[PDB]
């Protein structure tokens, strides 16, 4: 079976029909890949099931040791959930027309020549392309996203929050994925700060959710 | 001087005043950096002197560090010749970080998208191998063995063969084996490019377009295959 320890999700399509999600799912849970129909975050601990207010950076679930290749399928780049997980986890955004590849070869070929611009930069005007760190035929998904340190890993956020609840809880999963860490508050209150975050309600500085786009498509630290 | 040991080519802008090229050229400059003003090409030897792939000249054992620089990805011919060569493309940005940080940075969070495929209909990645300290240019490029690496092409092309020059070029810098002649047909092969002539009846090898090259610069892969 090609797909043998992989997990799949499928973001999109951005254009109308650009791909058939369903047929290309179903070729590969006939082949043995596993699609994980929310997207990545199975493969993570839920960060919120505490319904915590002080978060440490995400974690790999025991699950993920059962797989050792993840994919996010896209017509093309785009910022949709799946998408922006997928670039915060370094997991590659590839073309439908790898699994094809991938058939026509009868094996898991090299994703490269179907690896998909990371997204637009409206900082700096331009597309961007991913970097993705190589599967290694020796870890699970688990060993490659404990020993992963993000762009974001050590710095300490502050997210000041007092529907568009949600939107806020995905910009500091997106952080924390990242390889940050995330303290919820409603003030500053004298605190410690690496770099505050609002969606736009005194000594870090302070950015918006823009910001952690730049930095998910850049895969760096844009402060710097 | 930060940029002593690289080699920049500058293209574009592509979009009117994207960035303020002549200010960048002369900051590299003043900075220890090696301007190429036709681009990379002098890093290799001319090959139009049927020869086989492109080595690096000496003159690259000099550096060790290269990169074609522009606002965003295009099909100029300095860009395209970047993504033969494998020489990062990066957005000027990079520069003035290098800059602000007074040593040459991961060029990594600056890295272009390596173009627009028409034939998956979707912008793609650059994928660079990283540029080891310890090698000089020279080394990186005589080691390097492109996607086209064996592939025996045909270009039958009988001032605007310049143009057709360019492709050949390509073919080579991805690592092909490439024989020129005006027509075939006995003869070898396992590709034929033609620009648009129509190539000769029939044939042992595909035909293919100069667009087959492009796609094969854009995704760094073999494309028939
Ligand atoms: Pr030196
Ligand atoms: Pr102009
Ligand atoms: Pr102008």
Redesign the interface.
């Known amino acids: 079976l090609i797909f043998d320890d992989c997990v799949f999700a499928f973001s999109g399509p951005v254009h109308e029909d650009?791909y058939d999600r369903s047929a290309l799912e179903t070729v590969v849970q006939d082949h043995g890949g596993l699609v994980l129909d929310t997207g990545l975050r199975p493969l993570f601990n839920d960060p919120f099931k505490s319904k915590q207010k002080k978060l440490r950076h995400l974690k790999p679930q025991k699950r993920s040791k059962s797989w050792n290749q993840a994919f996010v399928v896209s017509?093309?780049?785009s910022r949709k959930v799946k998408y922006l997980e997928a670039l915060a986890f370094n997991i590659p955004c590839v073309?439908p027309?790898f699994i094809k590849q991938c058939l026509k070869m009868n094996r898991v070929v090299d994703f490269?020549?179907?690896?998909?611009?990371?997204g637009y930069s409206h900082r700096?005007?331009?597309?961007?392309?991913?970097?993705i760190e190589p599967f290694d035929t020796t870890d699970s998904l688990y060993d490659r996203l404990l020993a992963r340190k993000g762009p974001l890993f050590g710095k300490k956020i502050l997210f000041i929050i007092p529907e568009q609840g949600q939107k806020a809880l995905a910009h500091v999963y997106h952080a924390l994925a990242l390889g940050a860490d995330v303290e919820i508050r409603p003030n500053v209150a004298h605190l410690e700060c690496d770099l505050i975050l609002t969606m736009d309600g005194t000594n870090c500085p302070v950015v918006d959710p823009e910001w952690i786009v730049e930095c998910l498509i850049?895969?760096?630290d844009?402060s710097?």
């Open positions: 650009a017509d093309t780049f073309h027309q490269s020549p179907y690896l998909l611009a990371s700096l005007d331009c597309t961007l392309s991913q970097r850049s895969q760096s844009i710097t």
